[PDB]
């Protein structure tokens with residue numbers, strides 16, 4: 001399914017992500033440099049921060065307690081639609097999901 005990573009300067013980068021693969025994993029393994037994913041996807045860092053387009057925030061499973069806690073430490077502006085994309089697993093329903101990436105993770 002399709003996923004669009006919009007870098008902070010507006011560049012739209014589309015990737016085909018297989019079901020069950022997290023947005024972070026697909027990102028860091030396909031040149032999406034503005035996403036670090038340092039902890040490896042256990043909601044243990046804030047380096048996979050992204051802003052989920054409001055047309056998809058409802059279809060994504062809500063952030064668990066751990067992510068909520070980690071999000072508090074994001075280095076870029078924390079917004080209502082901020083999410084640690086390693087916590088978002090790709091599924092067909094999410095096809096076309098768009099995420100805007102901040103100008104910094106560290």
Ligand code: FES
Nearest residue numbers: 037039043048086
């Ligand atoms: S890769 Fe560390 S919280 Fe997402």
